[PDB]
Amino acid sequence: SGALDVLQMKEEDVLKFLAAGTHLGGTNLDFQMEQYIYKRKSDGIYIINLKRTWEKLLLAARAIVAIENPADVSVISSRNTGQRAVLKFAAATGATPIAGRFTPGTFTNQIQAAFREPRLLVVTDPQADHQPLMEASYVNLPTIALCNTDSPLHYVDIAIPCNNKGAHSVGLMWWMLAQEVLRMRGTISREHPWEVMPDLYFYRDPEEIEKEEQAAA
Amino acid sequence: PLAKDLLHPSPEEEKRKHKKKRLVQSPNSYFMDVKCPGCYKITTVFSHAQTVVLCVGCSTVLCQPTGGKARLTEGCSFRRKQH
Amino acid sequence: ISIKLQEEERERRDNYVPEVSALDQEIIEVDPDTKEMLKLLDFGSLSNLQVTQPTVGMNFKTPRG
Amino acid sequence: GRMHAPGKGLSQSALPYRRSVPTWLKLTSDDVKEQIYKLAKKGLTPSQIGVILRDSHGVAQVRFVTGNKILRILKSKGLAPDLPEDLYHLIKKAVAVRKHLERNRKDKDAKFRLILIESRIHRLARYYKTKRVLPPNWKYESSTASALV
Amino acid sequence: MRAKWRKKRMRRLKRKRRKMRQRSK
Amino acid sequence: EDVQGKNCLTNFHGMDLTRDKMCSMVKKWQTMIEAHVDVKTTDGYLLRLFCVGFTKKRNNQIRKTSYAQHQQVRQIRKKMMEIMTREV
Amino acid sequence: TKKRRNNGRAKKGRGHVQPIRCTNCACCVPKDKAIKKFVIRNIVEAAAVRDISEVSVFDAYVLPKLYVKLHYCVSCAIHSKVVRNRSREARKDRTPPP
RNA sequence: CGCAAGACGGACCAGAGCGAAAGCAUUUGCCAAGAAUGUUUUCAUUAAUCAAGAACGAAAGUCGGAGGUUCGAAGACGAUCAGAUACCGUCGUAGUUCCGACCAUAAACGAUGCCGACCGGCGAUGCGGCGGCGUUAUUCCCAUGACCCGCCGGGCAGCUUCCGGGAAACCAAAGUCUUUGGGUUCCGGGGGGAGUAUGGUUGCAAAGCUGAAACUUAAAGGAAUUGACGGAAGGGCACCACC
């Protein structure tokens, strides 16, 4: 990510951030997130530094590529938004998804059915996905987190500063991270705007799913 | 944050802090070239004056004392002078 | 429950993608303060960034009680 | 923490690092001393002198401009008071309170604040007798106090 | 026996000892 | 004051507010400001005018309380007394 | 053992508060300690707002309300079922109930 | 509708303020006092805590006046009751109020000595100061108020956290303690006997301050858990319950 040109932030990537809204923080600020910030607005909303966002994205992707067997990375979302995004990320990268309800004791109770024993976690929200962050602290699990400006950084080893609230922002942030782990692995080249479209990862409200079910004809 | 540059406080952080609690102790006051338009002479007034600084050869009364910074009378301008 | 397909609206339909993405805005709405931070990156001037007149009267907090 | 209050105030005056005089100040150390003499003759304390100087005449610290400080400039020539200004002001306050408390025996709060002020006096008296800037024979008595204005 | 009433009893018992001691004076 | 013949001729004796209204006005989280003025008209009628005032929570006021200082209260009270004298 | 942090009452930096009298009983209770409940209440509930408005000399006359600030003795209050005992978790809830 | 007297200061009134604590709430004036902030003012170690000694010290209570509205120890009754010298009710003296003199005690409590340093996060509030788009008033600009968004200090607090501690309940202090030493005052040593006897001392008195022993005893006690129990709160079931 650093002092390098091949992994430097490109122009269409900035348009994809600014369009999604990954530069819009909360109204609140976590004390641990004060470095991943530029300034407030009027209306009180904190603006994230998209460079620092990209620096954490590549650091995260670097950590994800360093895991040799991909099938032991846990890609966790509980909140609606990320459910689809993580389910596609694991298709792209050959990781294992946990979309929705996280059973307490998946990482801890060795007799449970959902006893997955990963080497690295990715987390859509530290607040909503707090149980797996806590259970990472019982079986040594590094955690990557998609952290809003008011996301608690307890048990978070790389915090990617985003707007993990908004549906566009999350789908985008997962797509960026999925496309970067593949580029670093060497499954895509960096000269081709990637065939997979960031709209593929977006959560779709069932008002907008029943907008598709009508408007085909 | 664990790691803070305690020797190198960014000037946004230093001017924020209490004057006594700054890495090196530094006041929040300054001297003003206060000039009234009626008179010719530039008087040196202290920002946190706490007296009635008069025009010597009376054309006016320049500042009036308050809690902190004195009120410079309407008509008067000020340059903050430094070394 | 857990069946073979999973289940032709979750495996097949979830590969739904429109003509052009919602991130393909011709005119991106933008405040002067994220213009101020992109100006302190390599991205000082883009063509498809229409900077709004800034929001006036800071009045966003929920009244207490 | 204050002497006779629970107050943990931090309203201190904070001198700058650079003891070096500024540039703009055109008054030489002698004319500052001459103006200090002019203020002392009018009937002002080293506290009141220092305020009037830094306000109207842009002289931050007399110690910075000259070598010496305002009481030691008063004292060298003999414009300094016989008993210190701060112990004067406590004795002045104690005579004010005691006069109020002559016809207000009900005012128990006053009486308690008098004892706190009396303690400030005795405490400073004891300090200045170690530095012999008061006679060893001196002792603040509240009956002898009204003559000490 | 509430501790306040134990005190009151012991206080009135002490008052009846400065009666039998008040005769020899 | 006078009774002519099937006509009780009456004269103003004192205005009062309805307990209903007076109670409705006294809300928590604001300062009540009362005043009273011993005054005399140009004709020799002597009145005691009691004023009441309540500080207003502003249009954009996010802070819960709407209290005056005491100097603010007593300057208001001083203007109440000044005006009730001035207009009697 | 200490049940409440704020020892039942709402004084922190006082030492003394003026007492009031519980309305049901008449027991001297500290103001801050007392369970104060303000009651705005129509002089007639529902059965008579029909009948009285019909015999209202006026056309479109709103009724008055009755404004009484009740104080309560802690016993006064719990017997009268104004405040219930709560679980040691739910004791810490200070939001007035919906 | 008035008149008189004496209490008392509702609602506003807050986990708000001030005070060393006890305490302090109509208006206005006078009187001295005070913390906090502001300070490129002054003195220059003057300080922290404290045997002796001292000031203030709720309520009740005592002595001599003044006043006595309400309320009400004692007492007189009227009920309840087996009894009821009590709870309930009607009267009601001392007292409650004011003045001068005592008394010096309260679960006088944050049951938490004072001073100082350090170690988390958060949004509030009160006081002062400083800065910043905007709205409103004195409209005629200012500059001041009223909101608004921040920061700094000082205060009463609150929430939150595996800082750490603790027997735990809990505590940003009750932490920085076997990795034990920042300064200093008071004070505890199983339960009773006992805050008793005795001596001194203060007090007009009531009593307060200091204060044992014999003897007796295997526990008394703290916090938390489970159960049973309630003349506590809520929910649920049953024609061996009701409708």
mmCIF file with all atom_site columns, N, CA and C (backbone and C1' of nucleotides) in Angstrom, chain B residues 16-19 21 27-29 31 46 48 50 67-69 71 74 83, chain H residues 37-41 121 128-131 142-144 150-154:
data_model
loop_
_atom_site.group_PDB
_atom_site.id
_atom_site.type_symbol
_atom_site.label_atom_id
_atom_site.label_alt_id
_atom_site.label_comp_id
_atom_site.label_asym_id
_atom_site.label_entity_id
_atom_site.label_seq_id
_atom_site.pdbx_PDB_ins_code
_atom_site.Cartn_x
_atom_site.Cartn_y
_atom_site.Cartn_z
_atom_site.occupancy
_atom_site.B_iso_or_equiv
_atom_site.pdbx_formal_charge
_atom_site.auth_seq_id
_atom_site.auth_comp_id
_atom_site.auth_asym_id
_atom_site.auth_atom_id
_atom_site.pdbx_PDB_model_num
ATOM 1   N N     . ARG B 1 16  ? -4.920  24.177 21.637 1.00 0.00 ? 16  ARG B N     1
ATOM 2   C CA    . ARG B 1 16  ? -6.127  23.593 22.292 1.00 0.00 ? 16  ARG B CA    1
ATOM 3   C C     . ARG B 1 16  ? -5.926  23.584 23.815 1.00 0.00 ? 16  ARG B C     1
ATOM 4   N N     . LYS B 1 17  ? -4.805  23.012 24.278 1.00 0.00 ? 17  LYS B N     1
ATOM 5   C CA    . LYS B 1 17  ? -4.519  22.677 25.703 1.00 0.00 ? 17  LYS B CA    1
ATOM 6   C C     . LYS B 1 17  ? -4.497  23.926 26.592 1.00 0.00 ? 17  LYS B C     1
ATOM 7   N N     . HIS B 1 18  ? -4.636  23.709 27.903 1.00 0.00 ? 18  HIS B N     1
ATOM 8   C CA    . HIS B 1 18  ? -4.463  24.735 28.966 1.00 0.00 ? 18  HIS B CA    1
ATOM 9   C C     . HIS B 1 18  ? -3.020  25.242 28.929 1.00 0.00 ? 18  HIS B C     1
ATOM 10  N N     . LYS B 1 19  ? -2.839  26.556 29.104 1.00 0.00 ? 19  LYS B N     1
ATOM 11  C CA    . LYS B 1 19  ? -1.536  27.261 28.965 1.00 0.00 ? 19  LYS B CA    1
ATOM 12  C C     . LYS B 1 19  ? -0.474  26.602 29.851 1.00 0.00 ? 19  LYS B C     1
ATOM 13  N N     . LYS B 1 21  ? -0.444  23.509 31.079 1.00 0.00 ? 21  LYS B N     1
ATOM 14  C CA    . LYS B 1 21  ? -0.287  22.062 30.757 1.00 0.00 ? 21  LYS B CA    1
ATOM 15  C C     . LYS B 1 21  ? 0.375   21.861 29.383 1.00 0.00 ? 21  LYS B C     1
ATOM 16  N N     . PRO B 1 27  ? 1.787   31.637 27.384 1.00 0.00 ? 27  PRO B N     1
ATOM 17  C CA    . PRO B 1 27  ? 0.535   32.357 27.643 1.00 0.00 ? 27  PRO B CA    1
ATOM 18  C C     . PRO B 1 27  ? -0.382  32.523 26.418 1.00 0.00 ? 27  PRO B C     1
ATOM 19  N N     . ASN B 1 28  ? -1.635  32.928 26.665 1.00 0.00 ? 28  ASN B N     1
ATOM 20  C CA    . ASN B 1 28  ? -2.698  33.155 25.645 1.00 0.00 ? 28  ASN B CA    1
ATOM 21  C C     . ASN B 1 28  ? -2.991  34.655 25.516 1.00 0.00 ? 28  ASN B C     1
ATOM 22  N N     . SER B 1 29  ? -2.064  35.507 25.967 1.00 0.00 ? 29  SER B N     1
ATOM 23  C CA    . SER B 1 29  ? -2.164  36.987 25.893 1.00 0.00 ? 29  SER B CA    1
ATOM 24  C C     . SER B 1 29  ? -1.118  37.520 24.909 1.00 0.00 ? 29  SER B C     1
ATOM 25  N N     . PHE B 1 31  ? 0.299   41.806 23.193 1.00 0.00 ? 31  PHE B N     1
ATOM 26  C CA    . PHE B 1 31  ? 0.261   43.290 23.228 1.00 0.00 ? 31  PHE B CA    1
ATOM 27  C C     . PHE B 1 31  ? -0.287  43.813 21.896 1.00 0.00 ? 31  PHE B C     1
ATOM 28  N N     . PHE B 1 46  ? -2.336  45.979 26.733 1.00 0.00 ? 46  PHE B N     1
ATOM 29  C CA    . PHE B 1 46  ? -2.334  44.529 27.055 1.00 0.00 ? 46  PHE B CA    1
ATOM 30  C C     . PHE B 1 46  ? -3.745  43.981 26.824 1.00 0.00 ? 46  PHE B C     1
ATOM 31  N N     . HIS B 1 48  ? -5.627  41.398 27.938 1.00 0.00 ? 48  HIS B N     1
ATOM 32  C CA    . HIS B 1 48  ? -6.370  41.173 29.209 1.00 0.00 ? 48  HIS B CA    1
ATOM 33  C C     . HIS B 1 48  ? -6.089  42.344 30.159 1.00 0.00 ? 48  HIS B C     1
ATOM 34  N N     . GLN B 1 50  ? -7.641  44.930 32.149 1.00 0.00 ? 50  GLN B N     1
ATOM 35  C CA    . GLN B 1 50  ? -8.187  44.973 33.542 1.00 0.00 ? 50  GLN B CA    1
ATOM 36  C C     . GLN B 1 50  ? -7.997  46.364 34.176 1.00 0.00 ? 50  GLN B C     1
ATOM 37  N N     . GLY B 1 67  ? -14.100 40.276 32.237 1.00 0.00 ? 67  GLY B N     1
ATOM 38  C CA    . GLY B 1 67  ? -13.575 39.009 32.783 1.00 0.00 ? 67  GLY B CA    1
ATOM 39  C C     . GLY B 1 67  ? -12.208 38.677 32.208 1.00 0.00 ? 67  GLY B C     1
ATOM 40  N N     . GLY B 1 68  ? -12.161 38.332 30.916 1.00 0.00 ? 68  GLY B N     1
ATOM 41  C CA    . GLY B 1 68  ? -10.921 38.042 30.172 1.00 0.00 ? 68  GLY B CA    1
ATOM 42  C C     . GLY B 1 68  ? -10.440 39.262 29.409 1.00 0.00 ? 68  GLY B C     1
ATOM 43  N N     . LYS B 1 69  ? -10.410 39.174 28.072 1.00 0.00 ? 69  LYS B N     1
ATOM 44  C CA    . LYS B 1 69  ? -9.964  40.260 27.156 1.00 0.00 ? 69  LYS B CA    1
ATOM 45  C C     . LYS B 1 69  ? -10.847 41.495 27.351 1.00 0.00 ? 69  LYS B C     1
ATOM 46  N N     . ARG B 1 71  ? -12.719 45.063 26.304 1.00 0.00 ? 71  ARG B N     1
ATOM 47  C CA    . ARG B 1 71  ? -13.454 45.599 25.127 1.00 0.00 ? 71  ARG B CA    1
ATOM 48  C C     . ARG B 1 71  ? -12.708 46.829 24.602 1.00 0.00 ? 71  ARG B C     1
ATOM 49  N N     . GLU B 1 74  ? -15.451 50.987 20.161 1.00 0.00 ? 74  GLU B N     1
ATOM 50  C CA    . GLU B 1 74  ? -15.879 51.015 18.732 1.00 0.00 ? 74  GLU B CA    1
ATOM 51  C C     . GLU B 1 74  ? -15.300 52.271 18.069 1.00 0.00 ? 74  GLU B C     1
ATOM 52  N N     . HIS B 1 83  ? 7.627   39.215 18.910 1.00 0.00 ? 83  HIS B N     1
ATOM 53  C CA    . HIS B 1 83  ? 9.111   39.144 18.799 1.00 0.00 ? 83  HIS B CA    1
ATOM 54  C C     . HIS B 1 83  ? 9.529   37.743 18.328 1.00 0.00 ? 83  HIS B C     1
ATOM 55  P P     . U   H 2 37  ? -9.936  28.046 38.547 1.00 0.00 ? 37  U   H P     1
ATOM 56  O "O5'" . U   H 2 37  ? -10.080 28.917 37.224 1.00 0.00 ? 37  U   H "O5'" 1
ATOM 57  C "C5'" . U   H 2 37  ? -10.806 28.430 36.084 1.00 0.00 ? 37  U   H "C5'" 1
ATOM 58  C "C4'" . U   H 2 37  ? -11.486 29.580 35.379 1.00 0.00 ? 37  U   H "C4'" 1
ATOM 59  C "C3'" . U   H 2 37  ? -10.567 30.611 34.744 1.00 0.00 ? 37  U   H "C3'" 1
ATOM 60  O "O3'" . U   H 2 37  ? -10.132 30.138 33.476 1.00 0.00 ? 37  U   H "O3'" 1
ATOM 61  C "C1'" . U   H 2 37  ? -12.273 31.706 35.954 1.00 0.00 ? 37  U   H "C1'" 1
ATOM 62  P P     . G   H 2 38  ? -8.690  30.525 32.942 1.00 0.00 ? 38  G   H P     1
ATOM 63  O "O5'" . G   H 2 38  ? -8.749  32.110 32.913 1.00 0.00 ? 38  G   H "O5'" 1
ATOM 64  C "C5'" . G   H 2 38  ? -9.373  32.793 31.824 1.00 0.00 ? 38  G   H "C5'" 1
ATOM 65  C "C4'" . G   H 2 38  ? -9.121  34.266 31.963 1.00 0.00 ? 38  G   H "C4'" 1
ATOM 66  C "C3'" . G   H 2 38  ? -7.657  34.652 32.089 1.00 0.00 ? 38  G   H "C3'" 1
ATOM 67  O "O3'" . G   H 2 38  ? -7.023  34.618 30.814 1.00 0.00 ? 38  G   H "O3'" 1
ATOM 68  C "C1'" . G   H 2 38  ? -8.973  35.848 33.664 1.00 0.00 ? 38  G   H "C1'" 1
ATOM 69  P P     . U   H 2 39  ? -5.551  33.995 30.668 1.00 0.00 ? 39  U   H P     1
ATOM 70  O "O5'" . U   H 2 39  ? -4.661  35.024 31.497 1.00 0.00 ? 39  U   H "O5'" 1
ATOM 71  C "C5'" . U   H 2 39  ? -4.570  36.385 31.048 1.00 0.00 ? 39  U   H "C5'" 1
ATOM 72  C "C4'" . U   H 2 39  ? -3.885  37.269 32.061 1.00 0.00 ? 39  U   H "C4'" 1
ATOM 73  C "C3'" . U   H 2 39  ? -2.571  36.773 32.639 1.00 0.00 ? 39  U   H "C3'" 1
ATOM 74  O "O3'" . U   H 2 39  ? -1.508  36.969 31.710 1.00 0.00 ? 39  U   H "O3'" 1
ATOM 75  C "C1'" . U   H 2 39  ? -3.891  37.795 34.336 1.00 0.00 ? 39  U   H "C1'" 1
ATOM 76  P P     . U   H 2 40  ? -0.784  35.729 30.996 1.00 0.00 ? 40  U   H P     1
ATOM 77  O "O5'" . U   H 2 40  ? 0.729   36.220 30.904 1.00 0.00 ? 40  U   H "O5'" 1
ATOM 78  C "C5'" . U   H 2 40  ? 1.526   36.279 32.103 1.00 0.00 ? 40  U   H "C5'" 1
ATOM 79  C "C4'" . U   H 2 40  ? 2.474   37.452 32.092 1.00 0.00 ? 40  U   H "C4'" 1
ATOM 80  C "C3'" . U   H 2 40  ? 1.844   38.846 32.150 1.00 0.00 ? 40  U   H "C3'" 1
ATOM 81  O "O3'" . U   H 2 40  ? 2.436   39.581 33.208 1.00 0.00 ? 40  U   H "O3'" 1
ATOM 82  C "C1'" . U   H 2 40  ? 3.385   38.695 30.343 1.00 0.00 ? 40  U   H "C1'" 1
ATOM 83  P P     . U   H 2 41  ? 1.922   39.370 34.699 1.00 0.00 ? 41  U   H P     1
ATOM 84  O "O5'" . U   H 2 41  ? 1.497   40.844 35.127 1.00 0.00 ? 41  U   H "O5'" 1
ATOM 85  C "C5'" . U   H 2 41  ? 2.458   41.825 35.550 1.00 0.00 ? 41  U   H "C5'" 1
ATOM 86  C "C4'" . U   H 2 41  ? 2.036   42.454 36.855 1.00 0.00 ? 41  U   H "C4'" 1
ATOM 87  C "C3'" . U   H 2 41  ? 2.770   41.958 38.085 1.00 0.00 ? 41  U   H "C3'" 1
ATOM 88  O "O3'" . U   H 2 41  ? 4.036   42.607 38.181 1.00 0.00 ? 41  U   H "O3'" 1
ATOM 89  C "C1'" . U   H 2 41  ? 0.459   41.932 38.523 1.00 0.00 ? 41  U   H "C1'" 1
ATOM 90  P P     . G   H 2 121 ? -9.263  9.007  27.911 1.00 0.00 ? 121 G   H P     1
ATOM 91  O "O5'" . G   H 2 121 ? -10.615 8.628  27.167 1.00 0.00 ? 121 G   H "O5'" 1
ATOM 92  C "C5'" . G   H 2 121 ? -10.607 7.674  26.092 1.00 0.00 ? 121 G   H "C5'" 1
ATOM 93  C "C4'" . G   H 2 121 ? -11.992 7.117  25.861 1.00 0.00 ? 121 G   H "C4'" 1
ATOM 94  C "C3'" . G   H 2 121 ? -13.138 8.111  25.788 1.00 0.00 ? 121 G   H "C3'" 1
ATOM 95  O "O3'" . G   H 2 121 ? -13.142 8.872  24.587 1.00 0.00 ? 121 G   H "O3'" 1
ATOM 96  C "C1'" . G   H 2 121 ? -13.785 6.307  27.134 1.00 0.00 ? 121 G   H "C1'" 1
ATOM 97  P P     . G   H 2 128 ? -21.092 32.800 34.579 1.00 0.00 ? 128 G   H P     1
ATOM 98  O "O5'" . G   H 2 128 ? -19.526 32.954 34.329 1.00 0.00 ? 128 G   H "O5'" 1
ATOM 99  C "C5'" . G   H 2 128 ? -18.704 33.700 35.242 1.00 0.00 ? 128 G   H "C5'" 1
ATOM 100 C "C4'" . G   H 2 128 ? -17.242 33.473 34.957 1.00 0.00 ? 128 G   H "C4'" 1
ATOM 101 C "C3'" . G   H 2 128 ? -16.773 33.752 33.540 1.00 0.00 ? 128 G   H "C3'" 1
ATOM 102 O "O3'" . G   H 2 128 ? -16.640 35.147 33.282 1.00 0.00 ? 128 G   H "O3'" 1
ATOM 103 C "C1'" . G   H 2 128 ? -15.825 31.736 34.289 1.00 0.00 ? 128 G   H "C1'" 1
ATOM 104 P P     . G   H 2 129 ? -16.819 35.708 31.794 1.00 0.00 ? 129 G   H P     1
ATOM 105 O "O5'" . G   H 2 129 ? -15.610 35.027 31.015 1.00 0.00 ? 129 G   H "O5'" 1
ATOM 106 C "C5'" . G   H 2 129 ? -14.287 35.536 31.224 1.00 0.00 ? 129 G   H "C5'" 1
ATOM 107 C "C4'" . G   H 2 129 ? -13.237 34.615 30.652 1.00 0.00 ? 129 G   H "C4'" 1
ATOM 108 C "C3'" . G   H 2 129 ? -13.153 34.534 29.139 1.00 0.00 ? 129 G   H "C3'" 1
ATOM 109 O "O3'" . G   H 2 129 ? -12.512 35.673 28.582 1.00 0.00 ? 129 G   H "O3'" 1
ATOM 110 C "C1'" . G   H 2 129 ? -12.988 32.371 30.048 1.00 0.00 ? 129 G   H "C1'" 1
ATOM 111 P P     . C   H 2 130 ? -13.055 36.322 27.231 1.00 0.00 ? 130 C   H P     1
ATOM 112 O "O5'" . C   H 2 130 ? -12.516 35.329 26.115 1.00 0.00 ? 130 C   H "O5'" 1
ATOM 113 C "C5'" . C   H 2 130 ? -11.107 35.150 25.934 1.00 0.00 ? 130 C   H "C5'" 1
ATOM 114 C "C4'" . C   H 2 130 ? -10.836 33.898 25.145 1.00 0.00 ? 130 C   H "C4'" 1
ATOM 115 C "C3'" . C   H 2 130 ? -11.437 33.839 23.752 1.00 0.00 ? 130 C   H "C3'" 1
ATOM 116 O "O3'" . C   H 2 130 ? -10.796 34.696 22.809 1.00 0.00 ? 130 C   H "O3'" 1
ATOM 117 C "C1'" . C   H 2 130 ? -11.785 31.783 24.816 1.00 0.00 ? 130 C   H "C1'" 1
ATOM 118 P P     . G   H 2 131 ? -11.678 35.495 21.732 1.00 0.00 ? 131 G   H P     1
ATOM 119 O "O5'" . G   H 2 131 ? -12.119 34.344 20.722 1.00 0.00 ? 131 G   H "O5'" 1
ATOM 120 C "C5'" . G   H 2 131 ? -11.144 33.776 19.826 1.00 0.00 ? 131 G   H "C5'" 1
ATOM 121 C "C4'" . G   H 2 131 ? -11.619 32.471 19.233 1.00 0.00 ? 131 G   H "C4'" 1
ATOM 122 C "C3'" . G   H 2 131 ? -12.717 32.541 18.189 1.00 0.00 ? 131 G   H "C3'" 1
ATOM 123 O "O3'" . G   H 2 131 ? -12.321 33.064 16.926 1.00 0.00 ? 131 G   H "O3'" 1
ATOM 124 C "C1'" . G   H 2 131 ? -13.118 30.715 19.615 1.00 0.00 ? 131 G   H "C1'" 1
ATOM 125 P P     . C   H 2 142 ? -23.845 44.994 12.683 1.00 0.00 ? 142 C   H P     1
ATOM 126 O "O5'" . C   H 2 142 ? -22.611 45.761 13.343 1.00 0.00 ? 142 C   H "O5'" 1
ATOM 127 C "C5'" . C   H 2 142 ? -22.004 45.329 14.579 1.00 0.00 ? 142 C   H "C5'" 1
ATOM 128 C "C4'" . C   H 2 142 ? -21.573 46.533 15.383 1.00 0.00 ? 142 C   H "C4'" 1
ATOM 129 C "C3'" . C   H 2 142 ? -21.014 46.256 16.771 1.00 0.00 ? 142 C   H "C3'" 1
ATOM 130 O "O3'" . C   H 2 142 ? -19.620 45.962 16.722 1.00 0.00 ? 142 C   H "O3'" 1
ATOM 131 C "C1'" . C   H 2 142 ? -22.391 48.237 16.709 1.00 0.00 ? 142 C   H "C1'" 1
ATOM 132 P P     . A   H 2 143 ? -19.087 44.497 17.092 1.00 0.00 ? 143 A   H P     1
ATOM 133 O "O5'" . A   H 2 143 ? -19.393 44.383 18.652 1.00 0.00 ? 143 A   H "O5'" 1
ATOM 134 C "C5'" . A   H 2 143 ? -18.674 45.169 19.621 1.00 0.00 ? 143 A   H "C5'" 1
ATOM 135 C "C4'" . A   H 2 143 ? -19.506 45.352 20.872 1.00 0.00 ? 143 A   H "C4'" 1
ATOM 136 C "C3'" . A   H 2 143 ? -19.943 44.066 21.574 1.00 0.00 ? 143 A   H "C3'" 1
ATOM 137 O "O3'" . A   H 2 143 ? -18.943 43.647 22.507 1.00 0.00 ? 143 A   H "O3'" 1
ATOM 138 C "C1'" . A   H 2 143 ? -21.814 45.518 21.278 1.00 0.00 ? 143 A   H "C1'" 1
ATOM 139 P P     . U   H 2 144 ? -19.094 42.260 23.314 1.00 0.00 ? 144 U   H P     1
ATOM 140 O "O5'" . U   H 2 144 ? -20.134 42.628 24.466 1.00 0.00 ? 144 U   H "O5'" 1
ATOM 141 C "C5'" . U   H 2 144 ? -20.943 41.627 25.127 1.00 0.00 ? 144 U   H "C5'" 1
ATOM 142 C "C4'" . U   H 2 144 ? -22.252 42.231 25.593 1.00 0.00 ? 144 U   H "C4'" 1
ATOM 143 C "C3'" . U   H 2 144 ? -23.386 41.253 25.870 1.00 0.00 ? 144 U   H "C3'" 1
ATOM 144 O "O3'" . U   H 2 144 ? -23.320 40.700 27.180 1.00 0.00 ? 144 U   H "O3'" 1
ATOM 145 C "C1'" . U   H 2 144 ? -24.187 43.002 24.496 1.00 0.00 ? 144 U   H "C1'" 1
ATOM 146 P P     . G   H 2 150 ? -20.755 19.797 19.165 1.00 0.00 ? 150 G   H P     1
ATOM 147 O "O5'" . G   H 2 150 ? -19.222 20.217 19.058 1.00 0.00 ? 150 G   H "O5'" 1
ATOM 148 C "C5'" . G   H 2 150 ? -18.457 20.589 20.221 1.00 0.00 ? 150 G   H "C5'" 1
ATOM 149 C "C4'" . G   H 2 150 ? -17.174 21.256 19.795 1.00 0.00 ? 150 G   H "C4'" 1
ATOM 150 C "C3'" . G   H 2 150 ? -16.116 21.408 20.876 1.00 0.00 ? 150 G   H "C3'" 1
ATOM 151 O "O3'" . G   H 2 150 ? -15.351 20.208 20.979 1.00 0.00 ? 150 G   H "O3'" 1
ATOM 152 C "C1'" . G   H 2 150 ? -16.474 23.501 19.852 1.00 0.00 ? 150 G   H "C1'" 1
ATOM 153 P P     . C   H 2 151 ? -14.947 19.610 22.420 1.00 0.00 ? 151 C   H P     1
ATOM 154 O "O5'" . C   H 2 151 ? -13.765 20.571 22.872 1.00 0.00 ? 151 C   H "O5'" 1
ATOM 155 C "C5'" . C   H 2 151 ? -12.608 20.751 22.040 1.00 0.00 ? 151 C   H "C5'" 1
ATOM 156 C "C4'" . C   H 2 151 ? -11.827 21.957 22.497 1.00 0.00 ? 151 C   H "C4'" 1
ATOM 157 C "C3'" . C   H 2 151 ? -11.467 21.980 23.973 1.00 0.00 ? 151 C   H "C3'" 1
ATOM 158 O "O3'" . C   H 2 151 ? -10.391 21.097 24.265 1.00 0.00 ? 151 C   H "O3'" 1
ATOM 159 C "C1'" . C   H 2 151 ? -12.253 24.105 23.310 1.00 0.00 ? 151 C   H "C1'" 1
ATOM 160 P P     . C   H 2 152 ? -10.318 20.364 25.684 1.00 0.00 ? 152 C   H P     1
ATOM 161 O "O5'" . C   H 2 152 ? -10.011 21.568 26.678 1.00 0.00 ? 152 C   H "O5'" 1
ATOM 162 C "C5'" . C   H 2 152 ? -8.725  22.203 26.618 1.00 0.00 ? 152 C   H "C5'" 1
ATOM 163 C "C4'" . C   H 2 152 ? -8.638  23.379 27.559 1.00 0.00 ? 152 C   H "C4'" 1
ATOM 164 C "C3'" . C   H 2 152 ? -9.004  23.129 29.010 1.00 0.00 ? 152 C   H "C3'" 1
ATOM 165 O "O3'" . C   H 2 152 ? -8.002  22.356 29.670 1.00 0.00 ? 152 C   H "O3'" 1
ATOM 166 C "C1'" . C   H 2 152 ? -9.896  25.200 28.317 1.00 0.00 ? 152 C   H "C1'" 1
ATOM 167 P P     . G   H 2 153 ? -8.405  21.253 30.778 1.00 0.00 ? 153 G   H P     1
ATOM 168 O "O5'" . G   H 2 153 ? -8.666  22.135 32.075 1.00 0.00 ? 153 G   H "O5'" 1
ATOM 169 C "C5'" . G   H 2 153 ? -7.625  23.004 32.544 1.00 0.00 ? 153 G   H "C5'" 1
ATOM 170 C "C4'" . G   H 2 153 ? -8.155  24.044 33.494 1.00 0.00 ? 153 G   H "C4'" 1
ATOM 171 C "C3'" . G   H 2 153 ? -8.939  23.523 34.681 1.00 0.00 ? 153 G   H "C3'" 1
ATOM 172 O "O3'" . G   H 2 153 ? -8.025  23.025 35.650 1.00 0.00 ? 153 G   H "O3'" 1
ATOM 173 C "C1'" . G   H 2 153 ? -10.068 25.365 33.731 1.00 0.00 ? 153 G   H "C1'" 1
ATOM 174 P P     . G   H 2 154 ? -8.360  21.678 36.435 1.00 0.00 ? 154 G   H P     1
ATOM 175 O "O5'" . G   H 2 154 ? -9.590  22.123 37.345 1.00 0.00 ? 154 G   H "O5'" 1
ATOM 176 C "C5'" . G   H 2 154 ? -9.351  23.067 38.397 1.00 0.00 ? 154 G   H "C5'" 1
ATOM 177 C "C4'" . G   H 2 154 ? -10.629 23.667 38.930 1.00 0.00 ? 154 G   H "C4'" 1
ATOM 178 C "C3'" . G   H 2 154 ? -11.728 22.727 39.381 1.00 0.00 ? 154 G   H "C3'" 1
ATOM 179 O "O3'" . G   H 2 154 ? -11.461 21.904 40.512 1.00 0.00 ? 154 G   H "O3'" 1
ATOM 180 C "C1'" . G   H 2 154 ? -12.675 24.599 38.322 1.00 0.00 ? 154 G   H "C1'" 1
#
